[PDB]
């Protein structure tokens, strides 16, 4: 039951655009990654009072996570094996490069989910992922086997 | 003033096509923040590795 | 209970600044490492009448350890895995390079704790490490994988 | 007990003029109706952060209903029989044209109450309404039998 | 410029005494929003009935 | 009564970006906000209130509205050596000053009114360094004559 027990404990943060959650600002490994095209204030004064420019090539924000939020801010391993990574809308596993879930996960209002192991190790953040026949794919932003922060995008990607 | 202009052109273009490219090559690197690559020695305007 | 049993056995020495402990002069791997900004006398005549200049780039003193306490002083491995190194105010673990402990550890009057395995091996000594979030950092002085003595320090570390 | 069961569930919105509930913005048949001389912020980001001009002959603000509250807001009938319409400070009935309540309904901090059937049909909104001997009246904004939005006002109406 | 002035007077007065009166006659109508009256054909600057 | 009477009282915290740094307290008409304490307040009858500086005393004032009038912290000017009480403990001292046990908290506390068991405000916290075993209280209070004064030991505290 770690898909809901552990995740509810995590200090992700939703982005209410005039009360409307459009994505989750997840504080991940030091600095925070707001999905950038997701707009709106956030439920933390140490997060909504946080000026941030664009990591526009990946479409992310950054941090400036102050000294009163860090240090268990979803510490993780950069790489991933083909693991059962879980979150609110279910789990994922895929064997080569990507992330794909059963149908009907929900990308709208969801992009921002950090991609935690049962152990609780982030390997990605949601971007999207159109249905590929049966499953629903996942575009994400993740890290390389070298640790290099890349993003993974199938064709015809989802909004946030 | 033309010669002064084009260097200011070549300044701001060098600003963007350095600072953007200095903002990049740390966004791939300073977001993983362990990031073991001692080839920071290509920008040396965005600096301070993690001893690795 | 090795975080307090094994440690109390060790020959650490508090630095009383006119009776006021501000740090711990610990005797590690041959030489002694007194935190330099910590000042005051020490509870050992083999360490109190001992003159020492500055490792001011690291903010340490050095040894010059007399031969009487030699042959048992806190031998260690220079490297460290992601280990649960432990001491008086609890344990630390971090996955690559830094050192972070649960909040309320205390960094005042404590910098000088050697950083011991359950085995009892010093991979670091405290420099402080600001309150980061729900946990707290540790700036330290430690050793490279190559054995090179370095200091690790997050932004805006602590006093001693 | 429909005067509180149905009514608490209804999505009225009080207007805190610096904390001071002076009137109730109500979200009626699509568009929202603020008693306009009542001023202040409101407890909904869908509602607080919107600019609105003046229905000055009636003294009301206006639409400003984002599409998320659409599909459920206070559908009603323009007309009314002489029925027992209800809200927090009791019920109301009158035979010809108007609305009058038992004494002690409260005018201050009240103007903004929508005027709901037991069935749940908003026929008007409070404006005011002086004491009439035994009873207290109600100045209102309401709708004609033709559906034309009109205001029915006795002499010497109330603050809001 | 007097003749240009008075038409600008007659403009802005016509603005207010049209747009206010166009803001009115829909406030009685477009607040009930069913509002079955096909005598919108008096302003035709505030427009779009509800097929009724 | 050190907590029953006080929780019932209309004290008001000053959150500086959510961080309480002091309590605005509504004392006999005019409210006495600690001035160096900054931040908004949990009362809009109090938070939308512009107030100039009593900077010699380092306070603000009122200008308190009339809804809270007729019930606010009625008090006396003088004080015997009484066991005045609040959240972080009680206080007593014989002549001129106010001192409490250690650990009362100077930070995020300066703003507490200084209430009798009866519930009468003779002072408000300013600060006051640890005094060996006990801790001081720099305060603002009233003279025996009534003159509003501030009492200050050397090297007082932040708020």
UniProtKB/Swiss-Prot annotation, chain F:
Modified residues (Phosphoserine): 8
Protein name according to UniProt: Capsid protein
Post-translational modification: Phosphorylated on serine and threonine residues.
Signal peptide annotation: none
Subunit structure: Part of a tetrameric complex composed of host CRM1, host importin alpha/beta dimer and the viral capsid; this complex blocks the receptor-mediated transport through the nuclear pore. Interacts with host phosphatase PPP1CA; this interaction dephosphorylates the capsid protein, which increases its ability to bind to the viral genome. Interacts with host karyopherin KPNA4; this interaction allows the nuclear import of the viral capsid protein. Interacts with spike glycoprotein E2. Interacts with host IRAK1; the interaction leads to inhibition of IRAK1-dependent signaling.
Active site per the UniProt annotation: 36, 58, 110
Residue(s) carrying Phosphothreonine: 11
Comment on protein domains: The very N-terminus plays a role in the particle assembly process. The N-terminus also contains a nuclear localization signal and a supraphysiological nuclear export signal (supraNES), which is an unusually strong NES that mediates host CRM1 binding in the absence of RanGTP and thus can bind CRM1, not only in the nucleus, but also in the cytoplasm. The C-terminus functions as a protease during translation to cleave itself from the translating structural polyprotein.
Record domain Peptidase S3: where: 10-159
Taxonomic placement: Viruses, Riboviria, Orthornavirae, Kitrinoviricota, Alsuviricetes
Compartmental location: Virion; Host cytoplasm; Host cell membrane; Host nucleus
Function: Forms an icosahedral capsid with a T=4 symmetry composed of 240 copies of the capsid protein surrounded by a lipid membrane through which penetrate 80 spikes composed of trimers of E1-E2 heterodimers. The capsid protein binds to the viral RNA genome at a site adjacent to a ribosome binding site for viral genome translation following genome release. Possesses a protease activity that results in its autocatalytic cleavage from the nascent structural protein.
Site residues by UniProt (Involved in dimerization of the capsid protein): 84, 117
Stretch list, region Ribosome-binding: 1-10
Top-level division of the source organism's lineage: Viruses
């Amino acid at each position: 039951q770690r898909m809901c027990m552990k995740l509810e404990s995590d200090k992700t943060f939703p982005i209410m655009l005039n009360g409307q959650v459009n994505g989750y600002a997840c504080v991940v490994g030091g600095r925070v990654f707001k999905p950038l095209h997701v707009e709106g204030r956030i439920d933390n004064e140490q997060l909504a009072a946080i000026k941030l420019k664009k990591a526009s090539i990946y479409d992310l924000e950054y941090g400036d996570v102050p000294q009163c939020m860090k240090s268990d801010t979803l510490q993780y391993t950069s790489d991933k094996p083909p693991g059962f990574y879980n979150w609110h809308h279910g789990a994922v596993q895929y064997e080569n490069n990507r992330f794909t879930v059963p149908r009907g996960v929900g990308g709208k209002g969801d992009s921002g989910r950090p991609i935690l192991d049962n152990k609780g190790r982030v390997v990605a953040i949601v971007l999207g992922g159109v249905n590929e026949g049966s499953r629903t794919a996942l575009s994400v932003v993740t890290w390389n086997q070298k640790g290099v922060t890349v993003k993974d995008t199938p064709e015809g990607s989802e909004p946030w | 003033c033309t010669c002064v202009a084009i260097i200011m052109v070549s300044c701001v273009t060098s600003v963007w096509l350095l600072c953007r490219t200095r903002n990049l090559c740390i966004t791939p690197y300073k977001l993983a923040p362990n990031a073991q690559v001692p080839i920071l020695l290509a920008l040396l305007c965005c600096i301070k590795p993690t001893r690795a």
